[PDB]
């Protein structure tokens, strides 16, 4: 019966160590952009989640409110904003979400969002900048951020002749163009979904193109698209976006891709998705986001609109990559931060070690000793070697009388005598405070 | 007007579940400060960390206080009510016989922010020499309680074996152990007479028997009290009491070496968590609340292992929810504005048409690891930018103007002092670093 629920896994000490290094990079970035932080309960009223999703963990009806586990951090955010009658906020939220999909049922989401009425595209641009800072800093190899706008999509599908009835499914097909070829995608829309091959080929004339600001300029000249009001504003915003990206120094990491069509329940403005590269060959997505201006309005009692743009870093995939990067380097990932083991080779010294280890703790030094009265020096050394503990402070009967400690570097094997009074400052010096 | 039914219905559902609440940025600043103290202590003691799913199999957690997940055609799941039972499952499942770990995570209880709340656990599992890990747990509690600077505190200590032997030697029947413990436990809230009456009148104990319990249970003291009970005519003939007292005497030797023997109060009325604890039991009290508990529980892991293999465990739980409030009140009483962001500088301008230049600059600052912001406006008024800083606690404003750009210069104004000085652009990163301490 010993088992974690399907789709969940524990984080082992080593996995926690990597998670800490990855979160530390991400949080340091969020904080650099003046983000506040909040937290919200792991479950919300079922009502709060109902009427938002077209796969949600519900809690047993036990005689109170009907409750559900958060499927994401964005809805809780909207509920939070509305509940506190906030009109603007810049926040990050790092927490687990829950989905009965098919470690994929419980996993971390890492969100940053900017809510408020501001001038066009400036916050949207900062979101892309934040993506890029983070992905670069993690050093998970090269990447590329795909960008599109919801209104460009709507307009493109309007003038190509896609019905409102098939709009939703056709986007699902187009959105596959990242992994698969246009030939497959075309054949699906036509063969499986009953889309006219005339419409399919027209969509193709747009959907197959990608590039930088150059493509935004071309489509602003497109005779058919120009005459669609929505596509035109969307393109105007992207043109603006590219200007700001250039100033942020990251226009070379951005690809305007008209096949990007996801999260169409939420997104009203830009849509983006970061993808890892090979060698530009897409190897998988590691972040996503966009502008969703209708969500908060759905919660505010007076339906007051609060624009929002934001991003989700896909940390689960990043945990794997970083873990494997570390493994391939023979770099032993430490699961503890102990700086020194207090040891002795002789017997009858437990009380002396207890006294020393405690002095070290008092000075704020990270120390341990074996829970054994007369451990063998070899066993203590082996313990340090496996744990990556860099120093061993060896206490002996004579050395105590002399007021010295034998300090041995575990890896270099070099041993030096240190005055007891100098021991605390000497350990700090060897580790870096 | 009061508002349409449309409006009032929406307001009616704009809430967090009962007995839960969001953490605002202000409360997150407090919680981050508390957790930093605690985690720095855990790490200082060589602890590893693990994490477990918020829900375990229902069969694993066996109550009218445990959240169950709806049967949606699959496993029957429940939300965890603590971290110790997930730990035991974790040790048994991974066939570990020793681990020293801490775990900080929310737990869930349908009791009467009190249904979802943080537990901060530290545990040392494994077969070791007597009472050293136990001593270290008390040290850890003492380090943390001290560093949190939440006033003076005390740690009550007792042992299950001492209660066992003590009940035996003064007449209690073995089968009435638990309920008499439940009564004795309330002597930190209630008088001995109220307690006695509940044991005799309610619990069917004999008057003579309860009186002998009162002779011991009413007592609390230091290491000298341990020595006295080792001299006790009746107790010192009971094997359990003898072991229990022997171990406390030893614990005290180690607490003296750790310089915390003066914070420990041996208290015979401490009888908590007897579903778990097989050795030491303890509870920290703030002096003017239950702010940290723990003890040794050697049978729990054994109950999850198929071959019933025992793994000795001793640990502690820090009541982090009571501390959050105390610390927040400390901060608010100082009227010290709690910042919710770390921004060092706002990039600003008074003139129009400089958005592009603020974008370039703020991005330069970000690339240098400086915490910077700018208002999301094409042409903000300087006043609005300065007010934003004043309200948020941002100490510097970097003002870009057309002339400054030509001179390769940036006007850097202190938000508090209002003094503005010119700064060569290439020096800006360093000049900011200096003024904010980095
Ligand atoms: Cl001023």
PDB file of N, CA and C in Angstrom, chain A residues 3 5-6 10-11 13 19-20 31-32 34 36-37 39 41-42 47 56 58 60 62 65 79 90 96 98 106 119 126 129 248 297 300-302 335-338 354 362 365-368 371 373, chain B residues 7 9-11 15 18 22-23 25 31-32 43-44 46 48-51 53-55 68 70 72 75 89-90 100 106 108 110 116 129 136 139 254 340 342-343 363 366-367 370 372-373 376-378:
ATOM      1  N   UNK A   3       2.779   4.119  -1.310  1.00  0.00           N
ATOM      2  CA  UNK A   3       2.663   4.722  -2.625  1.00  0.00           C
ATOM      3  C   UNK A   3       2.273   6.199  -2.548  1.00  0.00           C
ATOM      4  N   UNK A   5       0.150   9.068  -4.504  1.00  0.00           N
ATOM      5  CA  UNK A   5      -0.977   9.102  -5.437  1.00  0.00           C
ATOM      6  C   UNK A   5      -0.503   9.211  -6.881  1.00  0.00           C
ATOM      7  N   UNK A   6      -1.236   8.598  -7.807  1.00  0.00           N
ATOM      8  CA  UNK A   6      -0.879   8.656  -9.222  1.00  0.00           C
ATOM      9  C   UNK A   6      -0.577  10.084  -9.658  1.00  0.00           C
ATOM     10  N   UNK A  10       7.375  12.575  -4.470  1.00  0.00           N
ATOM     11  CA  UNK A  10       8.101  13.339  -3.472  1.00  0.00           C
ATOM     12  C   UNK A  10       9.267  14.043  -4.146  1.00  0.00           C
ATOM     13  N   UNK A  11       9.735  15.127  -3.541  1.00  0.00           N
ATOM     14  CA  UNK A  11      11.027  15.692  -3.902  1.00  0.00           C
ATOM     15  C   UNK A  11      12.058  15.144  -2.907  1.00  0.00           C
ATOM     16  N   UNK A  13      15.938  14.811  -1.227  1.00  0.00           N
ATOM     17  CA  UNK A  13      16.882  15.867  -0.849  1.00  0.00           C
ATOM     18  C   UNK A  13      17.673  16.424  -2.032  1.00  0.00           C
ATOM     19  N   UNK A  19      15.932  22.230  -7.038  1.00  0.00           N
ATOM     20  CA  UNK A  19      14.788  23.117  -6.991  1.00  0.00           C
ATOM     21  C   UNK A  19      15.179  24.434  -6.326  1.00  0.00           C
ATOM     22  N   UNK A  20      15.989  24.366  -5.279  1.00  0.00           N
ATOM     23  CA  UNK A  20      16.382  25.593  -4.602  1.00  0.00           C
ATOM     24  C   UNK A  20      17.251  26.488  -5.484  1.00  0.00           C
ATOM     25  N   UNK A  31      12.383  39.713  -8.300  1.00  0.00           N
ATOM     26  CA  UNK A  31      12.649  40.784  -7.332  1.00  0.00           C
ATOM     27  C   UNK A  31      13.374  41.974  -7.962  1.00  0.00           C
ATOM     28  N   UNK A  32      14.165  41.701  -8.993  1.00  0.00           N
ATOM     29  CA  UNK A  32      14.918  42.726  -9.695  1.00  0.00           C
ATOM     30  C   UNK A  32      13.945  43.642 -10.451  1.00  0.00           C
ATOM     31  N   UNK A  34      11.023  44.556  -9.241  1.00  0.00           N
ATOM     32  CA  UNK A  34      10.150  45.176  -8.262  1.00  0.00           C
ATOM     33  C   UNK A  34       8.840  44.453  -8.025  1.00  0.00           C
ATOM     34  N   UNK A  36       6.122  42.318  -6.103  1.00  0.00           N
ATOM     35  CA  UNK A  36       5.639  41.887  -4.792  1.00  0.00           C
ATOM     36  C   UNK A  36       5.372  40.382  -4.848  1.00  0.00           C
ATOM     37  N   UNK A  37       5.158  39.753  -3.695  1.00  0.00           N
ATOM     38  CA  UNK A  37       4.745  38.347  -3.683  1.00  0.00           C
ATOM     39  C   UNK A  37       3.480  38.146  -2.862  1.00  0.00           C
ATOM     40  N   UNK A  39       0.527  34.762  -1.604  1.00  0.00           N
ATOM     41  CA  UNK A  39       0.208  33.333  -1.600  1.00  0.00           C
ATOM     42  C   UNK A  39      -1.296  33.192  -1.433  1.00  0.00           C
ATOM     43  N   UNK A  41      -4.698  30.101  -0.951  1.00  0.00           N
ATOM     44  CA  UNK A  41      -4.957  28.740  -0.453  1.00  0.00           C
ATOM     45  C   UNK A  41      -4.909  27.714  -1.583  1.00  0.00           C
ATOM     46  N   UNK A  42      -4.525  26.475  -1.270  1.00  0.00           N
ATOM     47  CA  UNK A  42      -4.370  25.443  -2.293  1.00  0.00           C
ATOM     48  C   UNK A  42      -5.719  25.052  -2.885  1.00  0.00           C
ATOM     49  N   UNK A  47     -17.081  27.165  -7.035  1.00  0.00           N
ATOM     50  CA  UNK A  47     -17.683  28.263  -7.788  1.00  0.00           C
ATOM     51  C   UNK A  47     -16.625  29.165  -8.417  1.00  0.00           C
ATOM     52  N   UNK A  56     -10.454  18.818 -12.972  1.00  0.00           N
ATOM     53  CA  UNK A  56     -10.238  19.590 -11.755  1.00  0.00           C
ATOM     54  C   UNK A  56     -10.475  18.706 -10.537  1.00  0.00           C
ATOM     55  N   UNK A  58     -11.857  17.949  -7.313  1.00  0.00           N
ATOM     56  CA  UNK A  58     -12.848  18.456  -6.376  1.00  0.00           C
ATOM     57  C   UNK A  58     -12.668  17.781  -5.027  1.00  0.00           C
ATOM     58  N   UNK A  60     -14.281  16.208  -1.573  1.00  0.00           N
ATOM     59  CA  UNK A  60     -15.504  15.518  -1.192  1.00  0.00           C
ATOM     60  C   UNK A  60     -16.460  16.513  -0.552  1.00  0.00           C
ATOM     61  N   UNK A  62     -18.347  17.349   2.209  1.00  0.00           N
ATOM     62  CA  UNK A  62     -18.340  16.891   3.594  1.00  0.00           C
ATOM     63  C   UNK A  62     -19.224  17.759   4.482  1.00  0.00           C
ATOM     64  N   UNK A  65     -18.782  24.112   2.259  1.00  0.00           N
ATOM     65  CA  UNK A  65     -18.630  24.655   0.921  1.00  0.00           C
ATOM     66  C   UNK A  65     -18.121  23.563  -0.011  1.00  0.00           C
ATOM     67  N   UNK A  79      -9.118  36.389  -8.623  1.00  0.00           N
ATOM     68  CA  UNK A  79      -9.999  36.373  -7.454  1.00  0.00           C
ATOM     69  C   UNK A  79      -9.434  37.243  -6.333  1.00  0.00           C
ATOM     70  N   UNK A  90       1.835  44.234  -9.321  1.00  0.00           N
ATOM     71  CA  UNK A  90       2.892  43.485  -9.975  1.00  0.00           C
ATOM     72  C   UNK A  90       3.383  42.428  -8.998  1.00  0.00           C
ATOM     73  N   UNK A  96       2.300  25.136  -6.165  1.00  0.00           N
ATOM     74  CA  UNK A  96       1.861  23.934  -6.866  1.00  0.00           C
ATOM     75  C   UNK A  96       0.426  24.056  -7.368  1.00  0.00           C
ATOM     76  N   UNK A  98      -2.836  21.722  -9.518  1.00  0.00           N
ATOM     77  CA  UNK A  98      -3.361  20.359  -9.565  1.00  0.00           C
ATOM     78  C   UNK A  98      -4.310  20.118 -10.729  1.00  0.00           C
ATOM     79  N   UNK A 106       0.496  16.873  -9.962  1.00  0.00           N
ATOM     80  CA  UNK A 106       0.852  17.932  -9.034  1.00  0.00           C
ATOM     81  C   UNK A 106       2.218  18.448  -9.430  1.00  0.00           C
ATOM     82  N   UNK A 119       0.075  52.467 -20.337  1.00  0.00           N
ATOM     83  CA  UNK A 119       0.250  52.720 -21.763  1.00  0.00           C
ATOM     84  C   UNK A 119       0.550  51.412 -22.483  1.00  0.00           C
ATOM     85  N   UNK A 126       8.116  44.053 -20.717  1.00  0.00           N
ATOM     86  CA  UNK A 126       8.879  43.659 -19.549  1.00  0.00           C
ATOM     87  C   UNK A 126       8.710  42.168 -19.259  1.00  0.00           C
ATOM     88  N   UNK A 129      11.042  40.352 -21.333  1.00  0.00           N
ATOM     89  CA  UNK A 129      12.399  40.598 -20.868  1.00  0.00           C
ATOM     90  C   UNK A 129      12.696  39.703 -19.680  1.00  0.00           C
ATOM     91  N   UNK A 248      15.219  46.745 -25.059  1.00  0.00           N
ATOM     92  CA  UNK A 248      15.545  45.837 -23.962  1.00  0.00           C
ATOM     93  C   UNK A 248      16.673  44.870 -24.355  1.00  0.00           C
ATOM     94  N   UNK A 297     -12.421  41.172 -14.590  1.00  0.00           N
ATOM     95  CA  UNK A 297     -13.778  41.659 -14.760  1.00  0.00           C
ATOM     96  C   UNK A 297     -14.801  40.604 -14.386  1.00  0.00           C
ATOM     97  N   UNK A 300     -14.929  40.891 -10.352  1.00  0.00           N
ATOM     98  CA  UNK A 300     -15.363  42.146  -9.753  1.00  0.00           C
ATOM     99  C   UNK A 300     -16.886  42.264  -9.767  1.00  0.00           C
ATOM    100  N   UNK A 301     -17.494  42.472  -8.592  1.00  0.00           N
ATOM    101  CA  UNK A 301     -18.954  42.596  -8.500  1.00  0.00           C
ATOM    102  C   UNK A 301     -19.541  43.594  -9.499  1.00  0.00           C
ATOM    103  N   UNK A 302     -18.878  44.732  -9.705  1.00  0.00           N
ATOM    104  CA  UNK A 302     -19.331  45.724 -10.684  1.00  0.00           C
ATOM    105  C   UNK A 302     -18.733  45.479 -12.076  1.00  0.00           C
ATOM    106  N   UNK A 335      23.294  18.071  -0.762  1.00  0.00           N
ATOM    107  CA  UNK A 335      21.937  18.083  -0.248  1.00  0.00           C
ATOM    108  C   UNK A 335      21.918  18.737   1.127  1.00  0.00           C
ATOM    109  N   UNK A 336      23.105  19.060   1.632  1.00  0.00           N
ATOM    110  CA  UNK A 336      23.248  19.772   2.898  1.00  0.00           C
ATOM    111  C   UNK A 336      24.238  20.908   2.712  1.00  0.00           C
ATOM    112  N   UNK A 337      24.342  21.776   3.709  1.00  0.00           N
ATOM    113  CA  UNK A 337      25.266  22.902   3.646  1.00  0.00           C
ATOM    114  C   UNK A 337      26.322  22.871   4.758  1.00  0.00           C
ATOM    115  N   UNK A 338      26.408  21.756   5.470  1.00  0.00           N
ATOM    116  CA  UNK A 338      27.387  21.616   6.545  1.00  0.00           C
ATOM    117  C   UNK A 338      28.788  22.000   6.076  1.00  0.00           C
ATOM    118  N   UNK A 354      30.724  17.556  21.593  1.00  0.00           N
ATOM    119  CA  UNK A 354      29.450  18.211  21.837  1.00  0.00           C
ATOM    120  C   UNK A 354      29.680  19.677  22.160  1.00  0.00           C
ATOM    121  N   UNK A 362      26.695  28.296  17.735  1.00  0.00           N
ATOM    122  CA  UNK A 362      26.525  29.625  18.316  1.00  0.00           C
ATOM    123  C   UNK A 362      27.131  30.732  17.449  1.00  0.00           C
ATOM    124  N   UNK A 365      28.107  28.889  12.470  1.00  0.00           N
ATOM    125  CA  UNK A 365      28.739  27.929  11.571  1.00  0.00           C
ATOM    126  C   UNK A 365      27.878  26.669  11.427  1.00  0.00           C
ATOM    127  N   UNK A 366      27.831  26.122  10.219  1.00  0.00           N
ATOM    128  CA  UNK A 366      27.058  24.918   9.947  1.00  0.00           C
ATOM    129  C   UNK A 366      27.909  23.692  10.258  1.00  0.00           C
ATOM    130  N   UNK A 367      27.559  22.996  11.331  1.00  0.00           N
ATOM    131  CA  UNK A 367      28.393  21.908  11.818  1.00  0.00           C
ATOM    132  C   UNK A 367      27.581  20.678  12.201  1.00  0.00           C
ATOM    133  N   UNK A 368      28.263  19.539  12.248  1.00  0.00           N
ATOM    134  CA  UNK A 368      27.655  18.275  12.619  1.00  0.00           C
ATOM    135  C   UNK A 368      28.680  17.485  13.391  1.00  0.00           C
ATOM    136  N   UNK A 371      26.498  10.813  15.775  1.00  0.00           N
ATOM    137  CA  UNK A 371      25.820  10.494  17.028  1.00  0.00           C
ATOM    138  C   UNK A 371      26.345   9.186  17.623  1.00  0.00           C
ATOM    139  N   UNK A 373      29.600   7.635  20.388  1.00  0.00           N
ATOM    140  CA  UNK A 373      30.577   8.021  21.416  1.00  0.00           C
ATOM    141  C   UNK A 373      32.046   7.873  20.977  1.00  0.00           C
TER     142      UNK A 373
ATOM    143  N   UNK B   7     -24.913  42.030  -8.634  1.00  0.00           N
ATOM    144  CA  UNK B   7     -23.744  42.506  -7.899  1.00  0.00           C
ATOM    145  C   UNK B   7     -23.549  41.780  -6.561  1.00  0.00           C
ATOM    146  N   UNK B   9     -24.585  38.956  -5.523  1.00  0.00           N
ATOM    147  CA  UNK B   9     -24.262  37.537  -5.652  1.00  0.00           C
ATOM    148  C   UNK B   9     -22.766  37.366  -5.895  1.00  0.00           C
ATOM    149  N   UNK B  10     -22.216  38.226  -6.746  1.00  0.00           N
ATOM    150  CA  UNK B  10     -20.795  38.183  -7.062  1.00  0.00           C
ATOM    151  C   UNK B  10     -19.945  38.427  -5.825  1.00  0.00           C
ATOM    152  N   UNK B  11     -20.341  39.421  -5.029  1.00  0.00           N
ATOM    153  CA  UNK B  11     -19.655  39.747  -3.780  1.00  0.00           C
ATOM    154  C   UNK B  11     -19.726  38.577  -2.804  1.00  0.00           C
ATOM    155  N   UNK B  15     -14.602  35.171  -2.041  1.00  0.00           N
ATOM    156  CA  UNK B  15     -14.031  34.811  -0.751  1.00  0.00           C
ATOM    157  C   UNK B  15     -13.128  33.591  -0.874  1.00  0.00           C
ATOM    158  N   UNK B  18     -13.590  28.808   3.861  1.00  0.00           N
ATOM    159  CA  UNK B  18     -13.609  29.021   5.304  1.00  0.00           C
ATOM    160  C   UNK B  18     -12.347  28.482   5.982  1.00  0.00           C
ATOM    161  N   UNK B  22      -5.573  34.333   2.079  1.00  0.00           N
ATOM    162  CA  UNK B  22      -4.423  34.679   1.266  1.00  0.00           C
ATOM    163  C   UNK B  22      -3.356  35.277   2.161  1.00  0.00           C
ATOM    164  N   UNK B  23      -2.122  35.259   1.675  1.00  0.00           N
ATOM    165  CA  UNK B  23      -1.055  36.028   2.277  1.00  0.00           C
ATOM    166  C   UNK B  23      -0.863  37.222   1.361  1.00  0.00           C
ATOM    167  N   UNK B  25       1.286  40.803   0.278  1.00  0.00           N
ATOM    168  CA  UNK B  25       2.731  41.044   0.196  1.00  0.00           C
ATOM    169  C   UNK B  25       3.328  41.462   1.532  1.00  0.00           C
ATOM    170  N   UNK B  31       6.484  36.632   6.775  1.00  0.00           N
ATOM    171  CA  UNK B  31       6.676  35.193   6.766  1.00  0.00           C
ATOM    172  C   UNK B  31       8.064  34.820   6.230  1.00  0.00           C
ATOM    173  N   UNK B  32       8.528  35.542   5.216  1.00  0.00           N
ATOM    174  CA  UNK B  32       9.878  35.360   4.696  1.00  0.00           C
ATOM    175  C   UNK B  32      10.965  35.647   5.741  1.00  0.00           C
ATOM    176  N   UNK B  43      19.454  24.436   8.420  1.00  0.00           N
ATOM    177  CA  UNK B  43      20.597  24.189   7.542  1.00  0.00           C
ATOM    178  C   UNK B  43      21.901  24.141   8.322  1.00  0.00           C
ATOM    179  N   UNK B  44      21.956  24.937   9.386  1.00  0.00           N
ATOM    180  CA  UNK B  44      23.112  25.033  10.259  1.00  0.00           C
ATOM    181  C   UNK B  44      23.377  23.686  10.929  1.00  0.00           C
ATOM    182  N   UNK B  46      22.893  20.738   9.483  1.00  0.00           N
ATOM    183  CA  UNK B  46      23.169  19.720   8.485  1.00  0.00           C
ATOM    184  C   UNK B  46      21.955  18.995   7.939  1.00  0.00           C
ATOM    185  N   UNK B  48      18.889  17.844   5.618  1.00  0.00           N
ATOM    186  CA  UNK B  48      18.474  17.823   4.224  1.00  0.00           C
ATOM    187  C   UNK B  48      17.031  18.296   4.205  1.00  0.00           C
ATOM    188  N   UNK B  49      16.482  18.494   3.017  1.00  0.00           N
ATOM    189  CA  UNK B  49      15.070  18.815   2.914  1.00  0.00           C
ATOM    190  C   UNK B  49      14.383  17.895   1.917  1.00  0.00           C
ATOM    191  N   UNK B  50      13.126  17.568   2.197  1.00  0.00           N
ATOM    192  CA  UNK B  50      12.302  16.794   1.277  1.00  0.00           C
ATOM    193  C   UNK B  50      10.991  17.529   1.078  1.00  0.00           C
ATOM    194  N   UNK B  51      10.206  17.074   0.113  1.00  0.00           N
ATOM    195  CA  UNK B  51       8.857  17.584  -0.065  1.00  0.00           C
ATOM    196  C   UNK B  51       7.972  16.414  -0.466  1.00  0.00           C
ATOM    197  N   UNK B  53       3.702  15.180  -1.619  1.00  0.00           N
ATOM    198  CA  UNK B  53       2.469  15.690  -2.231  1.00  0.00           C
ATOM    199  C   UNK B  53       1.494  16.206  -1.171  1.00  0.00           C
ATOM    200  N   UNK B  54       0.672  17.190  -1.518  1.00  0.00           N
ATOM    201  CA  UNK B  54      -0.260  17.755  -0.550  1.00  0.00           C
ATOM    202  C   UNK B  54      -1.283  16.704  -0.117  1.00  0.00           C
ATOM    203  N   UNK B  55      -1.567  15.763  -1.007  1.00  0.00           N
ATOM    204  CA  UNK B  55      -2.483  14.678  -0.673  1.00  0.00           C
ATOM    205  C   UNK B  55      -1.815  13.309  -0.738  1.00  0.00           C
ATOM    206  N   UNK B  68     -11.169  14.961   2.513  1.00  0.00           N
ATOM    207  CA  UNK B  68     -11.131  13.882   1.538  1.00  0.00           C
ATOM    208  C   UNK B  68     -11.342  14.477   0.163  1.00  0.00           C
ATOM    209  N   UNK B  70     -13.041  14.125  -3.538  1.00  0.00           N
ATOM    210  CA  UNK B  70     -14.194  13.474  -4.147  1.00  0.00           C
ATOM    211  C   UNK B  70     -13.766  12.246  -4.939  1.00  0.00           C
ATOM    212  N   UNK B  72     -13.621  10.571  -7.834  1.00  0.00           N
ATOM    213  CA  UNK B  72     -13.830  10.926  -9.233  1.00  0.00           C
ATOM    214  C   UNK B  72     -13.422   9.793 -10.170  1.00  0.00           C
ATOM    215  N   UNK B  75      -8.161   6.547  -7.388  1.00  0.00           N
ATOM    216  CA  UNK B  75      -7.718   6.381  -6.007  1.00  0.00           C
ATOM    217  C   UNK B  75      -8.534   7.259  -5.060  1.00  0.00           C
ATOM    218  N   UNK B  89       5.808   7.347   5.862  1.00  0.00           N
ATOM    219  CA  UNK B  89       5.552   6.709   4.575  1.00  0.00           C
ATOM    220  C   UNK B  89       6.761   6.850   3.656  1.00  0.00           C
ATOM    221  N   UNK B  90       7.381   8.023   3.687  1.00  0.00           N
ATOM    222  CA  UNK B  90       8.546   8.295   2.856  1.00  0.00           C
ATOM    223  C   UNK B  90       9.743   7.423   3.236  1.00  0.00           C
ATOM    224  N   UNK B 100      18.257  12.896   8.272  1.00  0.00           N
ATOM    225  CA  UNK B 100      18.050  14.098   9.061  1.00  0.00           C
ATOM    226  C   UNK B 100      17.495  15.167   8.127  1.00  0.00           C
ATOM    227  N   UNK B 106       2.345  23.320   4.076  1.00  0.00           N
ATOM    228  CA  UNK B 106       1.015  23.491   4.651  1.00  0.00           C
ATOM    229  C   UNK B 106       0.359  22.150   4.961  1.00  0.00           C
ATOM    230  N   UNK B 108      -3.585  20.377   6.484  1.00  0.00           N
ATOM    231  CA  UNK B 108      -5.012  20.623   6.346  1.00  0.00           C
ATOM    232  C   UNK B 108      -5.844  19.894   7.393  1.00  0.00           C
ATOM    233  N   UNK B 110      -9.925  20.092   9.297  1.00  0.00           N
ATOM    234  CA  UNK B 110     -11.261  20.673   9.430  1.00  0.00           C
ATOM    235  C   UNK B 110     -11.595  20.980  10.895  1.00  0.00           C
ATOM    236  N   UNK B 116      -5.995  25.623   6.931  1.00  0.00           N
ATOM    237  CA  UNK B 116      -4.786  25.445   6.135  1.00  0.00           C
ATOM    238  C   UNK B 116      -3.720  26.307   6.781  1.00  0.00           C
ATOM    239  N   UNK B 129      23.517   6.629  19.248  1.00  0.00           N
ATOM    240  CA  UNK B 129      23.760   6.557  20.684  1.00  0.00           C
ATOM    241  C   UNK B 129      22.715   7.376  21.431  1.00  0.00           C
ATOM    242  N   UNK B 136      19.968  17.588  20.466  1.00  0.00           N
ATOM    243  CA  UNK B 136      20.138  18.517  19.360  1.00  0.00           C
ATOM    244  C   UNK B 136      18.810  19.168  18.965  1.00  0.00           C
ATOM    245  N   UNK B 139      18.169  21.947  21.218  1.00  0.00           N
ATOM    246  CA  UNK B 139      19.078  23.037  20.895  1.00  0.00           C
ATOM    247  C   UNK B 139      18.483  23.844  19.753  1.00  0.00           C
ATOM    248  N   UNK B 254      23.955  16.801  28.167  1.00  0.00           N
ATOM    249  CA  UNK B 254      24.144  17.333  26.818  1.00  0.00           C
ATOM    250  C   UNK B 254      23.598  18.754  26.656  1.00  0.00           C
ATOM    251  N   UNK B 340       7.533  46.015   0.522  1.00  0.00           N
ATOM    252  CA  UNK B 340       7.045  44.787  -0.073  1.00  0.00           C
ATOM    253  C   UNK B 340       7.795  44.509  -1.372  1.00  0.00           C
ATOM    254  N   UNK B 342      11.924  45.234  -3.369  1.00  0.00           N
ATOM    255  CA  UNK B 342      13.327  45.499  -3.063  1.00  0.00           C
ATOM    256  C   UNK B 342      13.955  46.535  -3.995  1.00  0.00           C
ATOM    257  N   UNK B 343      13.128  47.132  -4.844  1.00  0.00           N
ATOM    258  CA  UNK B 343      13.592  48.101  -5.833  1.00  0.00           C
ATOM    259  C   UNK B 343      14.548  49.137  -5.257  1.00  0.00           C
ATOM    260  N   UNK B 363      16.802  48.648 -18.585  1.00  0.00           N
ATOM    261  CA  UNK B 363      17.292  47.356 -19.041  1.00  0.00           C
ATOM    262  C   UNK B 363      18.781  47.197 -18.755  1.00  0.00           C
ATOM    263  N   UNK B 366      18.948  46.307 -15.079  1.00  0.00           N
ATOM    264  CA  UNK B 366      18.581  44.908 -14.886  1.00  0.00           C
ATOM    265  C   UNK B 366      19.738  43.972 -15.252  1.00  0.00           C
ATOM    266  N   UNK B 367      20.409  44.259 -16.361  1.00  0.00           N
ATOM    267  CA  UNK B 367      21.488  43.390 -16.816  1.00  0.00           C
ATOM    268  C   UNK B 367      22.647  43.393 -15.817  1.00  0.00           C
ATOM    269  N   UNK B 370      20.873  45.140 -10.914  1.00  0.00           N
ATOM    270  CA  UNK B 370      20.271  46.161 -10.068  1.00  0.00           C
ATOM    271  C   UNK B 370      18.749  46.036 -10.055  1.00  0.00           C
ATOM    272  N   UNK B 372      15.550  47.547 -10.416  1.00  0.00           N
ATOM    273  CA  UNK B 372      14.996  48.797 -10.919  1.00  0.00           C
ATOM    274  C   UNK B 372      13.615  48.637 -11.529  1.00  0.00           C
ATOM    275  N   UNK B 373      12.890  49.751 -11.570  1.00  0.00           N
ATOM    276  CA  UNK B 373      11.572  49.822 -12.181  1.00  0.00           C
ATOM    277  C   UNK B 373      11.455  51.103 -12.988  1.00  0.00           C
ATOM    278  N   UNK B 376       4.914  52.557 -16.247  1.00  0.00           N
ATOM    279  CA  UNK B 376       4.493  52.137 -17.579  1.00  0.00           C
ATOM    280  C   UNK B 376       3.690  53.223 -18.299  1.00  0.00           C
ATOM    281  N   UNK B 377       4.329  54.374 -18.487  1.00  0.00           N
ATOM    282  CA  UNK B 377       3.716  55.526 -19.143  1.00  0.00           C
ATOM    283  C   UNK B 377       4.700  56.139 -20.142  1.00  0.00           C
ATOM    284  N   UNK B 378       4.191  56.606 -21.280  1.00  0.00           N
ATOM    285  CA  UNK B 378       5.025  57.265 -22.281  1.00  0.00           C
ATOM    286  C   UNK B 378       5.579  58.592 -21.754  1.00  0.00           C
TER     287      UNK B 378
END
